[PDB]
Amino acid sequence: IVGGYTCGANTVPYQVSLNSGYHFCGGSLINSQWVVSAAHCYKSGIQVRLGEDNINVVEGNEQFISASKSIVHPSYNSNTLNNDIMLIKLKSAASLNSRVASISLPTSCASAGTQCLISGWGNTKSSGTSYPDVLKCLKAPILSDSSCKSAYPGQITSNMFCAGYLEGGKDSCQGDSGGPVVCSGKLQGIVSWGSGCAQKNKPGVYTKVCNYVSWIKQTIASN
Ligand SMILES: NCc1cccc(-n2cccc2)c1
Ligand SMILES: [Ca+2]
Prior knowledge:
Helix content is 7%, strand content 32%. 43% of the residues are buried. It contains two helices and 13 strands, in the order βββββββββαββββα. The protein has helices spanning 145-151, 213-221, and strands at residues 5-6, 15-19, 23-31, 34-37, 47-50, 63-72, 86-90, 115-120, 136-141, 160-163, 180-183, 186-193, 204-208. The protein folds into two domains: 1-12 and 103-210, Thrombin, subunit H; 13-102 and 211-222, Trypsin-like serine proteases (Thrombin, subunit H, Beta Barrel). The protein has 223 residues and is mostly beta strands. One of its GO terms (molecular function) is endopeptidase activity. It catalyses: Preferential cleavage: Arg-|-Xaa, Lys-|-Xaa.
């Protein structure tokens, strides 16, 4: 997250870190057994880390649970990033508490202008590279479809939305992918892509989670 703030330990209790020897992507806990992330984050051998603040130090609220399976969306295209969503099942259920909690799925799609909280452990600089160890947060609005399309001609599908600031300065970034965009207490987005970070006229692009609720629920119901 570029241009954000330190969230505070365990203030974003549905945020998980995906670890394969190291943090590589975020995710969102949606019930005790399942995490939502980005399909472009798929790999084998994922360990889900819950209850994290400083991802380099054991601080006492973590739960580390290996994935028993990953399910990438049936229509994910890694060239266009259309349908950039996957589900990850935990080998055992998380212990839910005030610091490890699931985020409800939306009932309807959020509108442009709605305020959202975007979070992750990604790079904090537009130019060059500095990772944070503690979780970062950014409040940002959803942008109109028309401005998202004008920002990225030929590349915004009906499964994507933009959020952030056309002026630049404040955006998600590398290492935040797969993490949450929460608006009015529901998961509306997944950190997906953009062109650099925090550049003028290049806001972040997010998977539109409200399009996937019926796939999510029916996949969980049979896996
Ligand atoms: N600024 C949005 C965004 C989201 C997620 C990743 C990236 N990114 C990856 C490499 C460089 C930037 C950007
Ligand atoms: Ca930790």
